[PDB]
Every structure is written in C-alpha cells, then in structure tokens.
Design an enzyme around this catalytic site. Structure first.
Site, PDB file in Angstrom:
ATOM      1  N   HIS B  41      23.168 -13.792 -25.511  1.00 32.54           N
ATOM      2  CA  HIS B  41      23.701 -14.857 -24.541  1.00 32.54           C
ATOM      3  C   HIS B  41      25.297 -15.018 -24.728  1.00 32.54           C
ATOM      4  CE1 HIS B  41      22.864 -17.051 -28.739  1.00 32.54           C
ATOM      5  NE2 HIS B  41      24.095 -17.392 -28.619  1.00 32.54           N
ATOM      6  N   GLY B 143      29.491 -21.189 -33.159  1.00 30.38           N
ATOM      7  CA  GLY B 143      30.325 -19.926 -33.458  1.00 30.38           C
ATOM      8  C   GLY B 143      29.556 -19.116 -34.818  1.00 30.38           C
ATOM      9  N   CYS B 145      26.743 -17.830 -34.314  1.00 37.09           N
ATOM     10  CA  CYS B 145      25.897 -17.048 -33.542  1.00 37.09           C
ATOM     11  C   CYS B 145      26.173 -15.347 -33.863  1.00 37.09           C
ATOM     12  CB  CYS B 145      25.997 -17.006 -32.167  1.00 37.09           C
ATOM     13  SG  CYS B 145      24.818 -18.458 -31.614  1.00 37.09           S
TER      14      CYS B 145
END
Ligand code: A1IPK
Ligand code: A1IPK
Ligand code: CL
Ligand code: CL
Ligand code: NA
Ligand code: NA
Lengths: 305, 305
Positions: B41, B143, B145
């Site tokens: 994503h 953040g 991720c």
C-alpha cells in the site's frame, strides 16, 4: 497506538561487547576505542570474592593474564588499570564500531535499555529502571557480568550501567562506567541489604497518560488535588513524593491530552485508596512505574534513531 | 536469576531497514540482497486506501516512481514486483549488511521481536506474540509500516512478520515476508474484526515454570490432573486446549524443575478457578501467556547470538 515495554535499538552497543577472561572467570567487557571496560571482580576466584583485596589481587595479575576476544579477533592487553570497581584494559586495537558515546550516571526513576550478554555475545535486550533503592530488576545469569545498560540520543550512546552482582534477594546491582556503584553496595560476596523499594510516582502518572492516550479512561475523575494533599496519601502507600519538577516534566503529556497534572493526581489518589476494583489499565491489574514521562512521549510521538 | 520481557538483539536487522517513498507516501522497507521488501500500500493515497485496486495502481507506477533511501545513499530501483500484499523492489545494489536469513511463517502462539522503525530509522524493539486470532498487540504509530518482526538463530535472522495496518480495535495485523496476511485480513481501510482471542495455555505453563525457577512457589500443589480434566476447566476460562504435543515441548522445563507437566496443570487449574488472591507470580497479578517454552529456556540458559 499501543503501549509496549520497548527498548532502544541495541545494534550500536552490540559492536562493543567483547569476551574478557582472567583466570577461570569469564565475563563481558565493553570495547570503546582502545579500552575495554569490565567488572573488576574478573580477577577474583570463588574463594576471593568472600573478602577481596583488589589492590593485592590486581598486583598479582599481568597484561598477559587477561584474555580479551572480540569474536574471531583476539585483542592483546597492553595495559591494565583499576578505576573504582571497573577494570580498564588497554588494548592494541581500537574498536572501529565505537559509537559516539558518553558515560552518564543516571538517577533513580530513570529507565534504560539493557543489552544482556553472555561470554561476549548479546543474548537479548529489555527495558529496566534504576529502582529508587539503587537496584534494578533485570534478568542476569552467571556470565552476564559486564552487560551494560544505556540510552540513545539520536546517534550518541549514553552508557549508564554495568552489571556486577545479584544480591541474595535476587535483585541486581551495578556501577556507572567510571566504576562507582549505584547504591550502598560493594563487590564482595557478603550479605548486603538494599533499602525498602518505593514506587516512582511520576512514572505511574506518566503511564496513566499513556493509558488515556490509548483509550483506557475509566480511572479519570472530575476532581483535582494539591501536590501536598496527594503526597500525604502517597507517602502512606510507600509511593515516592511528587515535586513541582515532576509536575513540570509531565507538562508535555498534560498538553497532548488536555488533562492537568494535578487532575491526573486526583485519579491516582482514588486508585491507591480504592484499588482498581478488578479493572485493568493498558492490560495490567497493577500500576506500572517503569515508564518515564519521556518514554511515553517517545512511544506516542515517534523518536527514531 | 530474573525474568524479563526480552527481545533478540536488533543490530542485525537494523542493517536492513530502509526508507521507501512512492508518491506522497513514505514507509519502511527491508533491504535483503538486491531486493527491498515493503508493504504494497506504499502506492496508495489515503483516498485509494478506502477501496484500493492494487493491480490498477501498479500499472501507473514505474521503477522511477519508487524512491528508496538507505540513510544518505539513494538506491536505484531497477524492477518492481507485487507478491500477495508485499511489493518487492529490485535495486542496483545488494545490501552489504545482509545477514544469513530465511522467511518463515510462524504459528499462533509463537513469539518474535519487533523492530519498530519510522521513516527508515529504527526506533525501538519489543517482544510480541502472534495472538490465537492472528493479531499482535504491539506499538505502532503511523509511519511504522514496513517494520519487521523476527527471531534470531545464532547468526540466521528468521523474518516472520511485516506490519501493514492497525485495526479499528487497536490491535495490529500484518503479513509474512511473502505478502500473505496472518489472519482473515485484507489491506483495505474497512472495518475488519478479529476472531475471539484465547489464552495461549502452553505459554502460561511455560511462564509458571519460569516462576518456580525464580522462587515463586506458593501456587504449587500436591495434586496432579489429567489432560482431559484440565482442558475441560480451561476451555471454560477461554484457555487454549493443551495437547500432548504441548506437553512434549514443555518437557525440558519439567526436567529442569522436577515438576511434572500435569503437576503444574493442577496448579494452573486452581489458579483459573480461584484467582491469585492478592499474590503475585514473578511480580504479576495476572497470568502471562506471551512467553513460549523456548523463550523461558533461552532466558534460563544463556543462549547467545
Ligand atoms: C556475573 C555474576 C558474578 O560474577 C557475581 C560475582 C559476585 C560478586 C559479588 C558478590 C557475589 C557474587 N555473582 C553473582 O552475583 C551471583 C549470581 C547468581 C545468578 C548466582 N549471585 C550470588 O552469588 C548471590 O549470593 C550472594 C551472597 C552474598 C553476597 C552477594 O552479593 C552482595 C551475593
Ligand atoms: C503504517 C500504517 C498504515 O499505513 C495503515 C494503512 C492502512 C491499511 C489498511 C487499512 C487501514 C489503513 N494505517 C493504519 O493501519 C492506521 C494506523 C493508525 C495509527 C492511524 N489505522 C487506522 O486507520 C484505523 O482505522 C481503520 C479503519 C478501517 C479499517 C482499518 O483496517 C482494516 C483500520
Ligand atoms: Cl571516578
Ligand atoms: Cl519491471
Ligand atoms: Na481527574
Ligand atoms: Na502440583
């Protein structure tokens, strides 16, 4: 979101851990530049620990009696020195992985990350707090001596602890990297007592903010207390006293939640006087006191390294 | 002695964490050999996340739309791939700090260390457990991720998790390094529920052994139970059923304590039916289930890496 017992990344420290062996004793040392730091009882036998004279014991030692090994590299000791309770061994090679570093002496209530090593190699990392009685509640098996605790400031490693002993009660004692013990303890195998442990109240208040930030808010109440009113209820529960400096330090967390510090203190007062009545905060049925207010800001604001 | 929530040293993994930027989105990536692994994503806007078509979006993307930065050095993307929910980006350089590694898919109940990074920089490390409902309860701000979870085996890093999303309830979901989600989750911003969470019983029994090794022994009883008798009392308290395979795994701890596994099950059964009554086990007023039996052996043996 979320709140976890989190520790600083240990990579920087991992490159400084060497195996130091003197006699039959083998422990961990901290290799910074061309100096290795290890707990000075490396030079003691099991029979010497009971009443050691370290000036006599070190006199019997030579540079070739210390075997320092960094992984596959055997470093050669070109000098040995004793500062307080730490033994500084001068070596013929400098650690290329030496980080920007500083030796600091932390205060009670401050927390740090411990890199627990055995025979020179890191085994794990966990977060500890200098207990108010100048002990720590970590996990150290034989050979973890010379494991160090630290905090990181962007790129600067602040070494604040070196483990030396497990007291008879199971609690742990150590020094700063200049060899001065935290607390009334001595590196001698004789029964030694630690003071009555107290609860770091400012860290409990920090943890309760982390709880509100995360969605636990049942403990909040419309009342407000005074620092003195709170401190009479707190002192009774062997809780540390809260000063105006603690209130100032909690300022940032109060700001991001909109909950005044003396407003949260009134919620902590009801908890102590009424318990949690079978409820949990951040999953715990007890009040955590090992999170500094700076820890809460970090875990809910990023802070990378 | 001592028992702490301990995590594998994160230095090895730190050498693999890079910042990945596609468009306006910037997250973390894992640099292994000449491949960077990041959550797919990365290519989505906040408006795309609500209902993303990853095959339509990736068509509009080219190798020059991905900006991968390892510190100050810009790696050059020479290829991009989408395996399940992970984006594999080919780079012009191989990570010289690549550890010997393997991608593994853990089971519910297994534990791992999480290196939480933000914008490519490691920020902290903590130990987690794959909940029975295929969630994990970590600490992740936006953040975070592309943060990775792992276990270390001497020198081999077993990457087992990559964080992708926080669910509405606050629990976290992610993938293995092949992009397959742990659990019934999809990478889309829609309400998704996790199955009813259960207590990992084998980890409680492992933890109770850690307690006896440390001196906590008030919970021990002269009685012994049967596996069926125990599993009938446990299921009522939403405790996972204990199989004979779990008993085999607890064998090492039984051998080191001299307390049979079904002898400890009898202590656990009274704990479930009668609670802790103001006692603590290893300092806790609740029963911990995020320590595997191998974790206890590791902390009570000195396994290094
Ligand atoms: C790395 C561990 C050690 O080398 C250390 C040596 C030592 C120094 C000072 C006093 C006692 C021992 N040993 C250590 O701390 C052990 C570790 C346990 C895991 C076995 N602890 C003890 O031996 C506990 O007994 C003890 C008796 C009297 C005094 C004392 O410390 C003041 C500890
Ligand atoms: C690193 C964090 C993200 O980039 C992630 C993107 C994302 C993917 C899938 C679904 C939703 C978002 N965001 C993320 O998980 C946020 C992180 C919080 C710290 C803000 N969580 C939410 O947005 C929670 O709301 C939410 C609503 C509906 C669905 C859903 O997940 C299925 C989450
Ligand atoms: Cl000094
Ligand atoms: Cl291509
Ligand atoms: Na209040
Ligand atoms: Na028993």
């Amino acid at each position: 979101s979320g709140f976890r017992k989190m520790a600083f990344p240990s990579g920087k420290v991992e490159g400084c851990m060497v195996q130091v062996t003197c006699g039959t004793t083998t422990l961990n040392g901290l290799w910074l530049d061309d100096v290795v730091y290890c707990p000075r009882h490396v030079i003691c036998t099991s029979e010497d620990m009971l009443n050691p004279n370290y000036e006599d014991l070190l006199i019997r030692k030579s540079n070739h009696n210390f075997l320092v090994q960094a992984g596959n590299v055997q470093l050669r000791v070109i000098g040995h020195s004793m500062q307080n309770c730490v033994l500084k061994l001068k070596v013929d090679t400098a650690n290329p992985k030496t980080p920007k570093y500083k030796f600091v002496r932390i205060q009670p209530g401050q927390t740090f990350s411990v890199l627990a090593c055995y025979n020179g190699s890191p085994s794990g990392v966990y977060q500890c707090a200098m207990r108010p009685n100048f002990t720590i509640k970590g996990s150290f098996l034989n050979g973890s001596c010379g494991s160090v605790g630290f905090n990181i400031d962007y790129d600067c490693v602040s070494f604040c602890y070196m483990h030396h002993m497990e007291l008879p009660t199971g609690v742990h004692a150590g020094t700063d990297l200049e060899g001065n013990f935290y607390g009334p303890f001595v590196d001698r195998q004789t029964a030694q007592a630690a003071g009555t442990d107290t609860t770091i109240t400012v860290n409990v208040l920090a943890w309760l903010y982390a709880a509100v930030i995360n969605g636990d808010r049942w403990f909040l109440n419309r009342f407000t207390t005074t620092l003195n009113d709170f401190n009479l209820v707190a002192m009774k529960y062997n809780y540390e006293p809260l000063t105006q400096d603690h209130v100032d330090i909690l300022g940032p967390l109060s700001a991001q939640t909109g909950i005044a510090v003396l407003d949260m203190c009134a919620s902590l007062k009801e908890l102590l006087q009424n318990g949690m009545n079978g409820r949990t905060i951040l999953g715990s049925a007890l009040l955590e006191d090992e999170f500094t207010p700076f820890d809460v800001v970090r875990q809910c604001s990023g802070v990378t390294f």
